[PDB]
Amino acid sequence: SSVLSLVNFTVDPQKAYLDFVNAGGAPLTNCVKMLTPKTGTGIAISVKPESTADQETYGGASVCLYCRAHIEHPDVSGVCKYKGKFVQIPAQCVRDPVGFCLSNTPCNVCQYWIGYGCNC
């Protein structure tokens, strides 16, 4: 509830979260990690869990900074890209799923995380 206060006192919540955890701040906790058959396609964001053996799956709203801090979404459409969906995170990055999601982007034609599955 410290980092959730912090991203409210700023114009650039993404940068503030990332700078906070990059300087030793505690990641946002209570991301909703699901139990899945680790047999999915491994795409970044999906209707249903799609985690591979190398990944974990989270409920989308719980790993979205803008949802968790109850602040305006930056998407031009106003519509969240995670909420109501599932988000696959690399299993090496489970310590800070919110940070991973702010730090990365899915490929626009293959839908896998760039640097974490996109073979384009």
Binding site: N30, K33, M34, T36, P37, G59, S62, R68, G84
Partner: protein, 283 residues
Amino acid sequence: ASADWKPGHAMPSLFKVQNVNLERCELANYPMPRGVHMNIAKYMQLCQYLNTCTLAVPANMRVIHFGAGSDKGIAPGTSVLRQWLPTDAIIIDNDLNEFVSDADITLFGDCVTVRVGQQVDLVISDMYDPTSNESKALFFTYLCNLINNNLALGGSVAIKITEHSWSVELYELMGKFAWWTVFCTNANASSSEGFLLGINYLGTIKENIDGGAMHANYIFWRNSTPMNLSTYSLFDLSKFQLKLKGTPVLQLKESQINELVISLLSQGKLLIRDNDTLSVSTD
């Protein structure tokens, strides 16, 4: 033990037919982690049990989830419902307190402020107010009225109760379903919690139930029944998702509901309700 591999225990007719006084609930084990929130395992086990029930599963399935929030401000049960239900199911969730969820619609405030315009297909309640063991009112008055007015014929409910959080009238309403039980997850087997399940609503009394006596039977069952904490049932999730049944939705006058229709409703093969666009809003 076999039962450790099941998602939990369902109250048997052996205890449903007893006739005993209400006694204190004394459980021997009153603790397994799984990395995830405990409610992840609890909801998935409730879903696994419902997978064995004759649930109606239509297109655009209408699901309301009450008590979906937590003191963490997140909704693990709603995310399990999202993982379990068909992609085109509509999920509406509600809690007294603010939270964020993967529901399609999220309503804050007392459930009595939730105005259901059209009948729904599935009601999940995890409502519980932490604050002699008499029948309780609270949100149970709202749920009872919902079953009588805003639930499709063929629809089902799963309503959290405990030793002290229960309702005479809600047990009696279980007699208006084709089948009912109380289901206790293995993940939370050391709590007096159970989910009162009504499967396939018929709108008419099929079983005459004395709700006070039946809660006494529920406690007698819990007091009589070793249950081990467990999550073994979540090891193979290959069949976890709710089967895509394409259950038909029909509009019928009560005059036309005959023996064939009742039989289809009772088998999980039909819903009767409006096929409108679902409007569910805060009053």
